[PDB]
Amino acid sequence: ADYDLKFGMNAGTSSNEYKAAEMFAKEVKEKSQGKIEISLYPSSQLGDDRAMLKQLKDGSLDFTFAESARFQLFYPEAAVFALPYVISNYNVAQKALFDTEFGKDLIKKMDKDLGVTLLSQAYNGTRQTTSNRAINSIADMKGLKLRVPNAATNLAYAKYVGASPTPMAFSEVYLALQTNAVDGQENPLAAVQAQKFYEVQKFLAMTNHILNDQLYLVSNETYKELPEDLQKVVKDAAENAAKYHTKLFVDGEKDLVTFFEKQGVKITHPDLVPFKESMKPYYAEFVKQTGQKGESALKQIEAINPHH
Ligand SMILES: CC(=O)N[C@H]1[C@H]([C@H](O)[C@H](O)CO)O[C@](O)(C(=O)O)C[C@@H]1O
Ligand SMILES: [Cl-]
Ligand SMILES: [Cl-]
Ligand SMILES: [Cs+]
Ligand SMILES: [Cs+]
């Protein structure tokens, strides 16, 4: 009521992201004694993630989600977070961001250059590929009309495996799939469930190509105005919500394959060696474009042990 704040997201009301944001909103309201109320704006009501990041910068939106990789729009080396097959697991994603020089620098720059404060990081699933025909091997990708988000790294995944990428906003995907304007898409299993893409896709291939994190971000214009006791409430609530957010994704990844099979989806397990070898020229291109900053980030990440 004193602070009527807004949290925008691309995800919808059935999603894990929305569930975690609800938990965050409820904890902030309770622990602030009602001084802060957070309203949720799902389903790209305020724009996509690129638009909502701009709104955080300007101070017209208070909170939003982004992947670490999405900062490639400003810092090309940050694409390293979404180079296909580079980041093996969430353990690596966490250490890449918080425990490398490159990641620490990125967090500083988001605050200083972009006016956003990183509150917490969660896991947001590993992307897989759905389609209207079976993907039994890399050969089946050739010429497949694959929807991707408006992001360079996803476009590259599609191009380098031989598909024909079609960029479009998340909100447009169900209808594109329903009408077969595209042949498939790619997203974590949880998003396939939340958006009901299983109603309009018969096949799911475990391509395991890009791992997504999720950052809880606040606008500096809003965070700086909170008394420090309320800043702590927001920070602590974001870290609690991120743990819950991660749990939701980890649990679903165990169970969701079975759910899809019961819904009539056929699951394939193509040999991933040719998918990985197909990305080698893209890694080369990334280093050529981003120079020593990129080569260095890639080496810092490749050094991380994936085992807990
Ligand atoms: C934080 C956020 O908005 N994530 C969104 C991502 C990123 O926009 C994309 O991976 C580029 O970073 O795209 C989706 O997976 C998608 O459109 O399929 C929806 C998801 O909600
Ligand atoms: Cl083909
Ligand atoms: Cl189906
Ligand atoms: Cs279809
Ligand atoms: Cs303050």
Are residues 294 and 80 in contact, defined by beta-carbon separation less than 8 angstroms? yes
- Reported as type and span, the H/E element at residue 216 is strand 211-219
For residue 154, the 8-state DSSP code is H
Contacts of residue 247, defined as CB under 8 A and 6 or more positions apart, other chains included, come to none
Contact 169, 44 (CB under 8 A): yes
Q: Are 23 and 241 in contact (CB under 8 A)?
A: yes
Q: CB under 6 Å to ligand 1: residues?
A: 10-11, 49, 65-67, 69-70, 149, 151, 170, 187, 191, 212
The structural domains of the chain, ordered by start, are: 1-308 (3.40.190.170)
User: What atom of ligand 1 comes closest to residue 153's alpha carbon?
Assistant: 11
Resolution of the coordinates in A?
A: 1.5
The token pair that represents 119 in the structure block: 């509150």
Alpha carbon distance 123, 110 (integer Å): 20
Answer whether 203's CB lies under 8 Å from 131's CB.
Answer: yes
CB count, 10 Å around CB of 208?
18
Alpha carbon distance 274, 85 (integer Å): 12
d(CA 234, CA 36): 9
Residues in the chain: 308
Using alpha carbons, select from 267, 240, 293 the residue that is nearest to residue 26: 240
Annotated ligand binding at 50? The verdict is no
Pocket test residue of 17, 147, 170, 217 for ligand 1, highest count of atoms within 8 A of CB:
170
Q: Is 208 labelled as part of a ligand binding site?
A: no
**Cα 65 from Cα 56, distance rounded (Å):** 10
Task: Name the closest-CA residue to atom 6, ligand 1.
Answer: 149
Task: Find, among 122, 131, 108, the residue nearest to 205 by Cα.
Answer: 131
Question: Is 147 assigned a ligand-binding role in the annotation?
Answer: yes
Determined by which method?
A: X-ray
127 is in an annotated binding site: yes
Residue owning tokens 């389609």: 131
Q: Which ligand is nearest to the CA of 182?
A: 4
Do 93 and 84 touch, CB atoms closer than 8 A?
A: no
